[PDB]
Amino acid sequence: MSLYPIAVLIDELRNEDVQLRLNSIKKLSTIALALGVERTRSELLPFLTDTIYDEDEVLLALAEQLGTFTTLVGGPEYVHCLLPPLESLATVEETVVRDKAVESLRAISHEHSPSDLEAHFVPLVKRLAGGDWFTSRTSACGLFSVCYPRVSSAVKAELRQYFRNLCSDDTPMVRRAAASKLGEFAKVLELDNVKSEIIPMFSNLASDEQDSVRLLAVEACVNIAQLLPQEDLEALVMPTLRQAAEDKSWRVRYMVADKFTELQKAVGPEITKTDLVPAFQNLMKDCEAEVRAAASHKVKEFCENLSADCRENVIMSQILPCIKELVSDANQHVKSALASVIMGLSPILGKDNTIEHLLPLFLAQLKDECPEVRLNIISNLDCVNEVIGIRQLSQSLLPAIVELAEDAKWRVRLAIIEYMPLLAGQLGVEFFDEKLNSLCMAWLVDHVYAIREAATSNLKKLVEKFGKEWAHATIIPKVLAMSGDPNYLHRMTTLFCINVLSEVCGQDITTKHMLPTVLRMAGDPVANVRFNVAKSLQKIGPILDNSTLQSEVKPILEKLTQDQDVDVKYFAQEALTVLSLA
Amino acid sequence: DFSFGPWKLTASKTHIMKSADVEKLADELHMPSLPEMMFGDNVLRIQHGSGFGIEFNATDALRCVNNDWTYTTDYKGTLLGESLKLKVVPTTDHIDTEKLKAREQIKFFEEVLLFEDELHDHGVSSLSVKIRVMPSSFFLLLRFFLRIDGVLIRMNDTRLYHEADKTYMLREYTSRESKIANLMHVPPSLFTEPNEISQYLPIKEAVCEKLVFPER
Amino acid sequence: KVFTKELDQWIEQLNECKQLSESQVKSLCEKAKEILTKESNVQEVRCPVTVCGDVHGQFHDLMELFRIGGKSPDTNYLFMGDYVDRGYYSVETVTLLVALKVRYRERITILRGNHESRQITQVYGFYDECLRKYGNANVWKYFTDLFDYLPLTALVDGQIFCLHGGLSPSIDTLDHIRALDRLQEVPHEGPMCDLLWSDPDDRGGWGISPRGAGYTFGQDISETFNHANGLTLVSRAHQLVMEGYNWCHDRNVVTIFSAPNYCYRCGNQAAIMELDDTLKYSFLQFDPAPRRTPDYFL
Ligand SMILES: [Mn+2]
């Protein structure tokens, strides 16, 4: 009993749940096609500025709609009309609704004319920055980077003083937001102005009272170093960066560690030896353990980007004496991060120096108590085999694969079955058949179905790596041998194997040794086997030629429709109608 | 600003207190520091057709803070009247949960924040209050949340129930806390949403007071 | 009448942990009635099965449970009750195990637990959740009215007793159970209440359970019962064990709890029992699954 569109849209706003309600707000664009171009401005838009207290999912879809609404108002000639309904959404209490509206504001800025830009959008940054509600003050920090170059040289000064008054605002929250968008601002100015205007703002933030401001200013330091010349780098950037690496809140010393690699690539090599390598030494051995794990994972990308005159030298004098002490600290987490990368050093070091000065420490990880350590050591060893031979280290992980393949907790056992195919292709066939076959075949009988599941699909890749014939030699005479196991779960495992292998074992094999095994099991007492026989038979069916479908599988499927078990019947009947058999 | 029956449910919610107005009151209460976000003028009040009512603010909530950097407060409303007001008395009869759970016409609802503090990034201390209305009753809940990241959690809930036309309204103050070292079996993903973790916090203080209506 | 077209579809939606709407549950519980209406109070199930106990709306832990014993219908399953009332996804949990029964009348067998009743579902959570998920009690009525049709006990290969609670003094032979009327809300007394509320322990004879309803039986009871009807052991789940399964009464009765870290209380390991072709038992311990507005608030 309502009236023209706006009312019928609000009648849906009083509906039960979100999706039912939200669905109409996604029609807010389609409603504006029916509405005249002006009707979208005259009637629609003013309703969307007196905001509506409502769930995030809707206000978010509302903000997205505004960022794609230029063509509906009449074109960029009237883009200024989208600003009021966005400013309100750039101030709602919920944070995500604010950033989405901000992003929509950053979008329609490009659509503004240079005259309309200075008269509508640039003032919009002021009302958000100078606004009382601290929420708007957060939103303002995100709109500076899109406008500052698009304006006149003088009004640029107003924005810089504005953005500066934001980094020194009383509220700590806005100081964070200003620190986050710092690099985006320094990136968007001229060269000489960032040296004098931004570096002050940058320093006072990296020494703030609240730790949340400190680390947020750090990640923006890289964005500054990407711009400055090498000379002015030690003069303005490093002073604050040097202290931030010693902040009593590990949250800060973590950021530089998680970004240590992104620093050297932007600061320079000689400055990496003057100031970075010194700090790295003390970061690998700082109090809170979380910081060490971060930097430990970055030992590889740090060594690689080092210059060529010292790559081999500074690693075995300033880096290694701290590595061994890391591998020997009881913190099971820090060694999990080192394990994934420590072996990426042999190609950077050499051949004689690594097997003699880098290998004996490697074993301590391969025999560590933590299962997660020796797991990561085994996935990142390809960078080792291309410098030192396989057997020089192959004869050592012999029991390491065993304890993981036979651990007491099944989560560990699964984790290594995923790495077996990668590991199989690096030891070749001659190794596997002698040692790694007794372990991989004992997985298809594991107590947990998850391992029997993984061990099944693990054979698909074990064939893709070795060849169609390796199954006919070491696998299939063993899989087919499980079909006599009493436990009906181990009996079914064969049927899941024949499904997988068929896809990657050609035709001549699925018909020679896999097909007669399936049809033999069609008389098992438990029906769980029999209806899966029909499932498997239709799975491998289209692989084999027609002569063998009409020969031995069809008489079974017809026979299986007479199994009183109602489950097989639907599957048996299904398995013929699936592939062109009555 | 709502109105149902002989009641006047006033709604007030705005921005935080300015920086200068913080130190001014920080000395009025002799508090070395106020919350990071002090929602001073944010107030949720309900008046009667006679002159008395209850008010939930932050200023009176920060008075109840005793000799602190967590802003823990046992505030449960500030009795407001015009020399003729409602009385407080301990009681045996308390709120009945099976009633509210019943789905009825939701009349009005506004969540009103009182303060929030990030606790030097060591936790969160938020004091909020929300209230709904039913056709034959109104219900409110005032809850001070506290999460000291790595140490403990504390929730000081305070509910207010009034069956419409029932000469009295109820108030129950629940305050439960626990050091996380004792609730290891709880996933930390719930240390942020209070409505889901309150069940796993042991009661420390329970009080049920009935607020009575005078006559004239 | 291929209505199995959508039955399989519902399970795929339930395996993604997404609700079944009111109009959908109305039709589902209707079929489940016709399937359960024919099952005797003592439902006999064939030799090769996997038997699990309580789940309590711990859907994400039920899926972890499937990766242990096997997915359905590949694995013959047997549930001993308590599908709801202490997890967050009590709706999705029971909605799946019911749809699987309607699909595979023979691959799974679901029993009635002490929480499969309108009395208790209203306080421990199932009803409160059924509202938050749909906005009314219709779904709750559809399920609760169906819970009355769940069999009380189960009897594998003629040898093993499977129920939720324990034994009863009014019940000495299985023929007695087959004579009861199990089409009512779980009573407060009588043998039907005892079967779903009794618990075993060390103290001999009958005793007063601290939970009021049911009783407390020991070695002298189980021996005198199992040897009187020809049984190897009894399988019960109402309790919970840090070990997931507990042997008691000189291995005359086994407990099987299949909900790991029960409401974040004891971090218990959840276990299940697998019965291969012949009846040789083998348990499987497992751990929890790790993966991760205007409201009528209280
Ligand atoms: Mn209980």
Numbering used by the authors:
A (entry chain A): 8 to 589
B (entry chain B): 12 to 78, 109 to 257
C (entry chain C): 4 to 295, 304 to 309
Paper text:
The broad substrate specificity and cellular functions of PP2A are controlled by formation of diverse heterotrimeric holoenzymes; each contains a common core enzyme formed by the scaffold (A) and catalytic (C or PP2Ac) subunits and a third variable regulatory subunit from four major families (B/B55/PR55, B’/B56/PR61, B”/PR72, and B”’/Striatin). TIPRL (target of rapamycin (TOR) signaling pathway regulator) is an important PP2A inhibitory protein and forms a complex with PP2Ac together with α431, excluding both scaffold and regulatory subunits. We determined the crystal structures of mouse TIPRL and its complex with the PP2A core enzyme at 2.7 and 3.8 Å, respectively. Structure-guided studies reveal that TIPRL inhibits PP2A by perturbing the phosphatase active site, and together with α4, exhibits a robust activity in disassembly of active PP2A holoenzymes in a highly sensitive methylation-responsive manner.
Surprisingly, TIPRL directly contacts the PP2A scaffold subunit by sitting with the side edge of its β-sheets on the top ridge of the N-terminal HEAT (Hungtinton-elongation factor-A subunit-TOR) repeats, overlapping with the binding sites of PP2A regulatory subunits with known holoenzyme structures. The conserved concave surface of TIPRL cuddles the highly conserved C-terminal peptide motif of PP2Ac (PP2A tail), and HW2 and HW3 arch toward and hug PP2Ac at two separate binding sites near the phosphatase active site. Moreover, the complex exhibits significant structural dynamics as reflected by the structural diversity of its four asymmetric copies in the crystal, with the root-mean-square-deviation (RMSD) between different copies up to 2.6 Å, revealing dynamic structural fluctuation in TIPRL–PP2A interactions. The highly conserved protein groove of TIPRL is largely positively charged (R144/173/184/200 and K171) with interspersed hydrophobic patches (T138, L141, F180, and I147) that mediate a specific interaction with the similarly conserved C-terminal peptide motif “D306Y307F308L309” in the PP2Ac tail. The carboxylate group of L309—the last residue of PP2Ac—is nudged closely to the positively changed side chain of R200 in TIPRL, exhibiting well-defined salt bridge and H-bond interactions. This interaction elegantly defines TIPRL’s selectivity for demethylated PP2Ac. Near the PP2A active site, HW3 of TIPRL makes well-defined hydrophobic and H-bond interactions to the β12–β13 and β3–α3 loops. HW2 directly contacts the helix switch of PP2Ac. TIPRL binding near the PP2A active site distorted PP2A active site loops and metal chelation residues, thus perturbing proper chelation of the two catalytic metal ions, with a misplaced metal ion left several angstroms from the active site that would not confer any enzymatic activity. TIPRL sits on the top ridge of HEAT repeats 2–6 of the PP2A scaffold subunit via the side edge of TIPRL’s elongated double-layer β-sheets.
